[PDB]
Enzyme design. Sequence first.
Site, PDB file in Angstrom:
ATOM      1  N   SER B 175       0.838  -1.190   0.000  1.00 38.95           N
ATOM      2  CA  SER B 175       0.000   0.000   0.000  1.00 38.95           C
ATOM      3  C   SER B 175       0.876   1.245   0.000  1.00 38.95           C
ATOM      4  CB  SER B 175      -0.933   0.002   1.213  1.00 38.95           C
ATOM      5  OG  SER B 175      -1.705   1.192   1.271  1.00 38.95           O
ATOM      6  N   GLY B 176       0.555   2.181  -0.887  1.00 39.91           N
ATOM      7  CA  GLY B 176       1.405   3.328  -1.103  1.00 39.91           C
ATOM      8  C   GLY B 176       2.451   3.151  -2.179  1.00 39.91           C
ATOM      9  N   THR B 180      -3.645   1.408  -5.434  1.00 37.94           N
ATOM     10  CA  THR B 180      -4.917   2.093  -5.616  1.00 37.94           C
ATOM     11  C   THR B 180      -5.066   2.601  -7.042  1.00 37.94           C
ATOM     12  OG1 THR B 180      -4.209   4.336  -5.093  1.00 37.94           O
ATOM     13  CG2 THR B 180      -4.537   2.821  -3.256  1.00 37.94           C
ATOM     14  N   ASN B 217       5.026   0.500   6.352  1.00 43.48           N
ATOM     15  CA  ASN B 217       4.074   1.390   5.705  1.00 43.48           C
ATOM     16  C   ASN B 217       3.195   2.068   6.741  1.00 43.48           C
ATOM     17  OD1 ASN B 217       2.296   2.737   4.061  1.00 43.48           O
ATOM     18  ND2 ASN B 217       1.207   0.898   3.396  1.00 43.48           N
ATOM     19  N   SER B 220      -0.914   0.811   5.680  1.00 43.89           N
ATOM     20  CA  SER B 220      -0.995  -0.591   5.302  1.00 43.89           C
ATOM     21  C   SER B 220      -2.419  -1.107   5.418  1.00 43.89           C
ATOM     22  CB  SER B 220      -0.078  -1.419   6.192  1.00 43.89           C
ATOM     23  OG  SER B 220      -0.221  -0.994   7.534  1.00 43.89           O
ATOM     24  N   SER B 221      -2.815  -1.932   4.457  1.00 45.67           N
ATOM     25  CA  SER B 221      -4.114  -2.581   4.491  1.00 45.67           C
ATOM     26  C   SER B 221      -4.010  -3.893   5.251  1.00 45.67           C
ATOM     27  CB  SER B 221      -4.631  -2.835   3.075  1.00 45.67           C
ATOM     28  OG  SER B 221      -3.774  -3.717   2.374  1.00 45.67           O
ATOM     29  N   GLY B 443       1.007  -8.454   2.089  1.00 45.92           N
ATOM     30  CA  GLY B 443       2.198  -9.011   1.490  1.00 45.92           C
ATOM     31  C   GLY B 443       2.951  -9.950   2.419  1.00 45.92           C
ATOM     32  N   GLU B 445       5.139 -10.244   4.495  1.00 49.36           N
ATOM     33  CA  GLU B 445       5.965  -9.332   5.266  1.00 49.36           C
ATOM     34  C   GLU B 445       6.993 -10.084   6.095  1.00 49.36           C
ATOM     35  OE1 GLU B 445       3.373  -7.087   7.713  1.00 49.36           O
ATOM     36  OE2 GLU B 445       1.948  -8.725   8.023  1.00 49.36           O
TER      37      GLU B 445
END
Lengths: 186, 742
Positions: B175-176, B180, B217, B220-221, B443, B445
Amino acid sequence: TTALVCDNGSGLVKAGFAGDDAPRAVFPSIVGRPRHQGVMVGMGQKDSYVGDEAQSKRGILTLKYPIEHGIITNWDDMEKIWHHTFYNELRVAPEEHPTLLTEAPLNPKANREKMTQIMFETFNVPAMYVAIQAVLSLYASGRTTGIVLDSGDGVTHNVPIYEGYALPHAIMRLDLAGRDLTDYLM
Amino acid sequence: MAVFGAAAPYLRKSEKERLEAQTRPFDLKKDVFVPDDKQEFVKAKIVSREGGKVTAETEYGKTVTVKEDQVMQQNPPKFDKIEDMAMLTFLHEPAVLYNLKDRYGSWMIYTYSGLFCVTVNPYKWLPVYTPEVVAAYRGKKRSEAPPHIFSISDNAYQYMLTDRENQSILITGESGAGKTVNTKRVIQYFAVIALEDQIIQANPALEAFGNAKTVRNDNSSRFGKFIRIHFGATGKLASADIETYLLEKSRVIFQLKAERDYHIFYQILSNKKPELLDMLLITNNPYDYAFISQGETTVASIDDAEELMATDNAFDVLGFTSEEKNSMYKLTGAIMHFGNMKFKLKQREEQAEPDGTEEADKSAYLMGLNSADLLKGLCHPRVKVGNEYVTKGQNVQQVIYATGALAKAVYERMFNWMVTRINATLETKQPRQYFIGVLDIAGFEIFDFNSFEQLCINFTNEKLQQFFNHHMFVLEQEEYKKEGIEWTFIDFGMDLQACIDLIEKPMGIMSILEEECMFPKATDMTFKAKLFDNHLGKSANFQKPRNIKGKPEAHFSLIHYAGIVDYNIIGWLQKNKDPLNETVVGLYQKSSLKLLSTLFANYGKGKAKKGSSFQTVSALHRENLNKLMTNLRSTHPHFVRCIIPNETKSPGVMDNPLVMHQLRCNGVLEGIRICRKGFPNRILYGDFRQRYRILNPASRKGAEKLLSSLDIDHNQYKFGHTKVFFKAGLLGLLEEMRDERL
Ligand SMILES: Nc1ncnc2c1ncn2[C@@H]1O[C@H](COP(=O)(O)OP(=O)(O)O)[C@@H](O)[C@H]1O
């Protein structure tokens, strides 16, 4: 590097690092095994408790000392005690540490020989040495002469030393010690 | 090359420039890839192979020696800048890194890598997103057109239309890093080929209710967003559907040392709405509330006050009333008020009783229950024994676990119902035929203090990667059954399933954890002892931890596709418990609010009713993952890989460690590795002749004569009927003999 100073004796293992002022780990040299059958599944009971852990489970274990009078009688138990001392009480790897062991005067020769063999094959220490328990007392007392009476828990002995020369023909050893005093008090 | 409007250069460089760049000296012997210190592999030259001594002369002026066991060739120039990484003559790890490096320096974003589509985000505007290329792609094929996500979008569309099935787009990135906007341009292209504004409009709600600050992040989602884009019979835009998966509940209660809870609590804690605070009894001080204060209190993430306003605006412009937003905010405040409850043991018993009652009173006044009644329902649950009810006893630990599970439950319930409301707003009455879903997931991670949540995330990503691997296996079997050349009938999934069996299977890590939080006096050391006693050595992937550079701590290590991961045990037992309190759930069913809808009904002849106490986050997670796999495995999938080039917003300059991290954690390297066991270099006979006929100048007889006169072994090449298959060494040797031919 650093050297390990393990004083086994019989009844109290006490180890640490060379250059320290006192032993870091001091615990009884006992190995307990459960003598009942165990009902709760999922407990994941282990089969032998060594050291200070065995003193908390006295009620359900049967305790054995692997060293009777200076000499070692259960080599598997002694191997467990050394493993516990190295990895669980001191938390060091014996591959990069010389180890100084001690024993009492006038012991069997195979005791010391097999101690060496274990410390090199099983634990893979880089070096080792076996010292007499009375010479070390005289070191720590700040003398260089004097007769030392080292009454441990399995063996008592006299070792007269003068100017750093030990007189082996005058060394006495007596197999009366704290364990026999405990049995007499019982 | 004019069909590509003004974006033609960025989309694909001209053949003329390709050939003008082909002319460049490259020594195949002493310019090989070399390990590095500041990076992993750097461009350098070797002076000589002096025994065990070599000397790498890099661009930076360094002359380090590397061992002869860690050197490997560099990609030839006649095959650099290749669009398909799978067609590379030599498949190495840093090889593809430098490939994408030169491609992003030359400003080519998209790159094919077999069954993937890799996309490094450009930081400045390009004409590649102009509608002209969108409209002008219609009529060009995947095999020939240069890489871009419009290609795979159209391929999914036409696959849907020919096979009468659903397709799945799996966009994979942080995310980022552009996810999106990547999905935004996807939905634009889909509308073009025939409700995106509504998607983006309702997005801030999900961004609030399902995003939290991690270390890698700040936005983060946590939940698995997944948008289903339906269609009609005529393949025209019909409607859009959305589902949420795998939303992590542990965040609502426990937060790590370096991370925060969800954004919403902080946005509410922004005093820019003092009416919310004075109507919810929320004091401004964030340290006040225990569920949250254990995480990072505040960070320079975003303008949280403005984000609160943007969410309130999105709410008021969504179908639901102002009272409903009011109830949402107050419910979140009640969840916040749960944490400060205080319980003590009784006089000469083992029963829990409340000493502090004020937060109890205010939380009840908010929730729409009675305070004494809620306290009684927490201290003294009633359970059903046959035809009677008997009261169960609780101590402080049990009532605290119940409170935490209640909070997690009500939060997740409100979240799912909010998503239902969103979908109802979006809903159009047009008939909805086969859909093409797009999936947004966490992800793989890795950290230095991985924990239970990271284990869950990695387990999910393991299921996904094994799914893709089996998919690519069946695709390669399809290629082989087309080519009429069928060999190597082993599948590519089990080699990864062996690691799954160490998490889900009975006596696996999750089952041992469930058993341990069921056992009477279990502790973390006992958990570790059972893990070791039951897996150490007897398994294949489970193994000891490693202590490097004085890392914090690690209790055991698993190996995944994305590398060896060391996990920490401390806290897992306490955080896995999910005992839901049935009496308080009934109280919620009997509320005077909207809460009675969220908790509408929740907890002979064969009943799988696991008790309220025999509930574990890991078990609920395994069930949810099972059903997500059942939803995906019915659709033909497609995969999108997003990589950040550098942590700084400055383009051009990259970070090789970050590139390697993304490649490993993403599984592009695993894809190329599955390829590396067969024949990845696959070329037809005609161009083969036109490029290698001068070696033996004069279709199976001449090719075979040349091959026998090129000293090629049988097992090294596979003779096909349209394309003859060769490996890395074969390509290198043919290149060398061409070079000496010239
Ligand atoms: N304060 C004390 N008074 C009397 N006996 C003691 C005291 N402290 C320890 N002991 C006895 O000393 C013995 C331990 O001696 P120790 O120096 O540990 O020899 P070893 O190291 O060979 O076991 C134990 O058997 C214990 O009974």
